[PDB]
RNA sequence: GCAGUCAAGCGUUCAUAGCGACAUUGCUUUUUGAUUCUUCGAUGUCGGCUCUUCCUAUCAUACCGAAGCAGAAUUCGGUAAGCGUUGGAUUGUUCACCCACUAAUAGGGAACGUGAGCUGGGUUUAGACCGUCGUGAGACAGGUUAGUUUUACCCUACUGAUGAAUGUUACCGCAAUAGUAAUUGAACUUAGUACGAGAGGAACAGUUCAUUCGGAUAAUUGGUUUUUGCGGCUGUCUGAUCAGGCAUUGCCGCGAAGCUACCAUCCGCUGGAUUAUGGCUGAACGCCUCUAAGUCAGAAUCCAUGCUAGAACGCGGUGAUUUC
RNA sequence: CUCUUAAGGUAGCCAAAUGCCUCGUCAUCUAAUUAGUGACGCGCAUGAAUGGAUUAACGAGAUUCCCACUGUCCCUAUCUA
RNA sequence: GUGAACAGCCUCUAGUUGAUAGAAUAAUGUAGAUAAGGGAAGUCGGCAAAAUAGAUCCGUAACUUCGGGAUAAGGAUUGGC
């Protein structure tokens, strides 16, 4: 997950590898996230380092707000296309990779959310829950 | 424990069988196996496709 | 000469060399330590491994996010019919290691056990314990002593038990036939026990019970000769290179002048022996219970057999042990049933559960029904039937 | 390159917490030289990729002793190589340099490991442009572009696989020897506590998860499809229909089974003895002293438990042992 | 104004396939660029048919980026002959 | 016949059915395919692969030697009856 974090993430199956773009899904300006580095993370020889639902990343702005663009940005996975299983048995997925925008300590950038949330990042981090829509 | 129902083919669905696909708006989708999810997929409509 | 940069090694070199087993029934290599102060038991079980299913079931675990709510387990069904006791080894202390000394049979064996002596019984006059039985004669003597003998001496006792392995859908006539360690109090008292059990059965729910751990003993399911890619997941070379791909580049520096045991290399892969532990018992069925396979949940009359019959196995109607999780060798597959060398205490190991539904689909295809009945329901007339 | 001895000095004061001039003793052989012993009827260059193993001058991780150690953070030092030591941008590069993650991103060896293992970007044949040099042919330790990477079937080693001979044949076992494995992080709680003027700010026990590794497994989800299993489609051929052939598996959708993925799930043991170190009793030396005798506690260490093979010249128990 | 040796680099162009120093300096593009591009120029050693500068079209030529694409890769699996 | 066609694919006439064979279907190959999520992070370098593609109708930039650039680009459509 990351730094910041409220409590622990069971293993969600990682979508993200470095050099994915995800959609940026809060109001801050941002169009794409890219994703540079996955906080949680450790290492093996030729393995990408890869993100998953509610792992904060290190991430670049490509496109928007150029106030907003050319530097590294912490942000937060809030819905990933691959799929995943969850302790209930159920293998579900969202229909897009998508992220937002947020400081070390997990406060957002922006005020709102748009898509659904997954819950395993609503639990995560608490101003992402706090501002998210619905959620799973 | 919940049997939930697949909302293309109207199949029951047991706990942790098929897959559930979470819409762009939120609607949830779910599939009972690989083929409701693929005719879905295709665009296919259920009132057509006679085994539903 | 100094490697670019630093990696763990592929593979477990404590799981050498990666041969063949010797035979296809894994060797219990270990039985728990003996409490002499509590009644003679049997330490393992023989059964054969049938299939896997589905459970759901509330978790009970304090500070889990899962915590009172309902998760979905694989589960594996291991066909457990009872076993039959026909001998008592009794084993000495040396210093050169545990040795038997004698091995006292029932008076009568039956085909099943007696098959398992022989490589042509079509054609065979089946001699097998004839002269033997005859030492039942004498008012006892003969056996009498040896029991006698094993009391007196000996250290460890373990009984000779075999499958009954007609009670199972296999095609297979010979039984299984193993030694199992009497952990029970007393070296008389289970020779005694050993004694009044010759000829008599013994049912898994006398050794093992709900939420008990227990290790799985198997030779693990066969692959033939593989190359080294698979074999210990070495990392394909690039598309680009000469002679093909799934090899390692370099076998070794050229100093030692040796290929060395510790690089990866083709060959067998599968068949192997392997102990695996810490397997918690989720069910333990009974074969006359023609509910075996319900809750106190869903209430349904339906016996643990899946629609379609266990794939590659066919039916249980037996006792079962049903296992969380996974274990090795296949369906078919002869497994040793061994409880824990020690005293888990893991709270995961202590945690005790029960079942709330049995997945019972049929497992030859995406089965959507679990009872005949429920099909009939959905469906409605078809035009079979009526 | 690395480590000492002396101690003038630094260090508010104070040589030696951490350092340390003038001098001075050494060690190493991944620097570079010096030499020219081997190889010029041949030993295939640089870098990378892949993979194994070894060293320790230890970066992380275990336990400790120091401090200019209040706490947190650090720094010096011991026992330690058991276990890890990464993802990228530019460059043929090694190196270098930035970004970024991390417990940490230590340093080295194995013919400057590793080309009948690859690659061929660089170097260093023959084409070619330029600059400098030259009357010229040509030259350049300058820039640039294009430039064929051969053989294993033999021995050995290594992986796996059979097997003669110990009356015959069978079943159940022992265990010498050899291998052996787990790893690291976070959160909750302890606690806004100990400590502190404040700013700040731990840990043990208990809980839940995760990282790297490993061994299996296939309920489930996903991948694969000659199930050529069902259906759909183009073109042609069998007078039409039905039903089929051909199109190097004609194409498309679904697709059981099998195989299989941190793309899936499950599992990965607990006793002793020690090291450093801190101590007990205690002389030598009527005092003192952890040490001389004796002794307690004690680490990711070691030895066992456990786990894998089972000596084809190690072994036990057991069954049946031929009239054609 | 002067010396060598006849003159003394005009018009242009430029770290260029010509720049040692050099991974030049500034700007741009990137999270990051010994790369690319635009600039700068006392240019080791650019420069006018020993042709200089420009240049539409063309190029299995060398080079840089972007979209699309994707098993190149993360990380491998499966099938046919 | 299809179709723009001396293309490819299937056919008639004519000609062949000849290029050791049998049984298996391990590794590793050679040749042919496919892959969830990501999308060049692989690599000296997108090498190899993949993606595009016929026709009709719309639409089409800089620049230019006014000839081009241009199928630029970007879109809709397409069977049977």
């Known amino acids: 997950s990351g730094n910041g974090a409220q409590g622990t993430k069971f293993r ?3 979508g993200l590898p470095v050099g994915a773009i995800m959609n940026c899904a809060d109001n801050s300006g941002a169009r794409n996230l890219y994703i540079i580095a996955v906080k949680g993370s450790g290492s093996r020889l030729n393995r990408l380092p890869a993100a998953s639902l509610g792992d904060m990343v290190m991430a670049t702005v490509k496109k928007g707000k150029p106030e907003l663009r050319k530097k590294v940005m912490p942000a ?4 990933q296309a691959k799929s995943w299983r969850r302790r209930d048995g159920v293998f579900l997925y969202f229909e897009d990779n998508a992220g937002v925008i947020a400081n070390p ?7 709102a959310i748009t898509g659904p949330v ?8 608490p101003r992402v829950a706090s501002n998210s829509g619905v959620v799973v | 424990m919940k049997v939930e129902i697949d909302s293309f083919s109207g199949a029951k669905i047991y706990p942790g069988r098929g897959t559930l696909f979470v819409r762009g708006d939120s609607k949830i989708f779910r599939f009972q196996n690989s ?4 005719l879905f997929k295709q665009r296919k409509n259920p009132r057509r496709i006679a085994w539903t | 000469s100094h490697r670019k940069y630093e990696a763990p090694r592929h593979g477990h070199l404590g799981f050498l060399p990666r041969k063949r087993a010797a035979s296809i029934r894994a060797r219990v290599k270990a039985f728990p330590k003996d409490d002499r102060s509590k009644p003679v038991a049997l330490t393992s079980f023989l059964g054969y491994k049938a299939g896997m299913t589905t459970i759901v079931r509330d978790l009970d675990r304090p500070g889990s996010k899962f915590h009172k709510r309902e998760v979905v387990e694989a589960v594996t069904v291991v066909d457990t019919p009872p076993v039959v006791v026909v001998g008592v080894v009794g084993y000495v202390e040396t210093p050169r290691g545990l040795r038997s000394l004698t091995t ?13 002596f022989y490589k042509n019984w079509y054609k065979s006059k089946k001699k097998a314990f004839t002269k033997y039985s005859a030492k039942y004669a004498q008012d006892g003597a003969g056996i009498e002593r040896e029991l006698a003998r094993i009391k007196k001496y000996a250290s460890v006792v373990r009984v000779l038990v075999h499958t009954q392995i007609r009670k199972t859908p296999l095609a297979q006539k010979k039984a299984h036939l193993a030694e199992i360690q009497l952990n029970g109090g007393s070296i008389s008292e289970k020779v005694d026990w050993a004694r009044e059990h010759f000829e008599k059965t013994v049912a898994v729910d006398s050794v093992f019970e709900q939420n008990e751990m227990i290790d799985a003993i198997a030779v693990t399911k066969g692959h033939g000769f593989e190359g080294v890619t698979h074999r210990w997941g070495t990392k394909k070379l690039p598309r680009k290179t000469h002679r093909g791909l799934r090899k390692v580049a370099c076998i070794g520096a050229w100093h030692p002048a040796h290929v060395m045991w510790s690089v990866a290399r083709a060959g067998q892969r599968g068949y192997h022996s392997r102990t695996s532990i810490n397997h918690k018992i989720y069910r333990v069925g009974k074969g006359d219970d023609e509910a075996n396979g319900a809750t106190s949940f869903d209430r349904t009359k339906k016996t643990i057999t899946p629609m379609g019959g266990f794939v590659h196995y066919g039916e249980i109607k037996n006792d079962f042990i049903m296992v969380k999780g996974c274990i090795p060798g296949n369906r078919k597959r002869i497994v040793t049933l061994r409880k824990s060398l020690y005293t888990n205490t893991s709270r995961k190991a202590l945690e005790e ?3 709330k539904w049995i997945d019972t689909a049929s497992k030859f295809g995406k089965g959507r029904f679990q009872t005949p009945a429920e099909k009939h329901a959905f469906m409605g007339t078809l035009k079979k039937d009526l």
Not at chain 1, 105 to 111: I, L, N, P, V
Not at chain 1, 118 to 124: H, N, P, R, W, Y
Not at chain 3, 104 to 116: F, I, N, P, Q, T
């Open chain 1, 105 to 111: 300590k997990g406060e957002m950038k922006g005020s």
């Open chain 3, 104 to 116: 006292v049979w029932a008076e009568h064996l039956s085909d099943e056990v007696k098959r398992r």
């Open chain 1, 12 to 14: 969600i199956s990682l």
């Open chain 1, 76 to 79: 937060i996975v809030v819905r």
């Open chain 3, 353 to 355: 559960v029960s079942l």
């Open chain 2, 35 to 38: 083929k409701s999810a693929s």
């Open chain 1, 118 to 125: 997954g819950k395993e990042c609503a639990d995560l981090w």
